[PDB]
Amino acid sequence: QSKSRKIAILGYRSVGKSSLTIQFVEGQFVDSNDPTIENTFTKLITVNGQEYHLQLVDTAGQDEYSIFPQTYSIDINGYILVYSVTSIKSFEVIKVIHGKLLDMVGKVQIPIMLVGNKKDLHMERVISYEEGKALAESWNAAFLESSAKENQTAVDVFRRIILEAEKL
Ligand SMILES: Nc1nc2c(ncn2[C@@H]2O[C@H](COP(=O)(O)OP(=O)(O)O)[C@@H](O)[C@H]2O)c(=O)[nH]1
């Protein structure tokens, strides 16, 4: 029988939070200039034979000054933290967000996924794979690079966070 899990997707503006989520949920790459507002999707996924009902919370992009909420610091089963490999600023910001997140969750190990998105834009990449891998390692977080244009990598992101959560 199925299990329910709630995942929050966090990160700086225009890193691809919406696009990655929509690619996973709907199978389509959408290019939109609407600002990302908090949006919750529901999605079925099977991971190692276990069926999951996912609630995916896309959050508005935040920056270093962003006060971290409290609503995103309880009842979440796992967090996907997204930066863009084409944006140094998004990478600086994801460190600040992670720090504020750990401060809010208290004395518990919470599944965290670091995601470097937009890996298809080879001519604009300014962050190496190794920089993100090393960051995730210092965090004990899973790490993947992704492209919202590539369905397999979006699926792999959301499978991975469920893999991490099930380890407890
Ligand atoms: N080439 C490419 N463009 C992307 C990718 N992800 C997002 N984008 C584009 O980047 C812009 C911001 O993406 P969006 O999903 O709205 O970012 P959000 O603010 O984090 O939700 C939009 O133009 C997207 O079409 C990606 O993986 N590859």
Residue numbers in the entry: 3 to 170
Text of the article:
A small GTPase, called Ras homolog enriched in brain (Rheb), is a positive regulator of mTORC1. The Y35N mutant assumes a very similar overall structure as the WT Rheb with a typical small GTPase protein fold composed of a six-stranded β-sheet surrounded by four α-helices.
To investigate the molecular basis for the constitutive activation of mTORC1 by the Y35N mutant, we determined the crystal structures of Y35NGppNHp and Y35NGDP at 2.0 Å and 2.1 Å resolution, respectively. In the Y35NGDP structure, no Mg2+ could be identified at the active site, although Mg2+ is present in the protein storage buffer and the crystallization solution. In contrast, the switch I region and the binding mode of GDP exhibit notable difference in Y35NGDP and WTGDP (RMSD of 2.2 Å for 9 Cα atoms of the switch I region using the least-squares fitting method). Similarly, in Y35AGDP, the switch I region adopts a similar conformation as that in WTGDP, suggesting that mutation Y35A does not affect the conformation of switch I. However, in Y35NGDP, the side chain of Asn35 flips away from the nucleotide and points toward the solvent (about 180° rotation from that of Asn35 in Y35NGppNHp). In the Y35NGDP structure, the switch I region assumes a similar conformation as WTGppNHp and Y35NGppNHp and, in particular, the side chain of Thr38 is oriented toward the nucleotide to avoid steric conflict with mTOR, and hence both Pro37 and Ile39 are in proper positions to make tight interactions with mTOR. In other words, Y35NGDP mimics WTGppNHP in binding to mTOR and thus is capable to activate mTORC1 in a similar way as WTGppNHp.
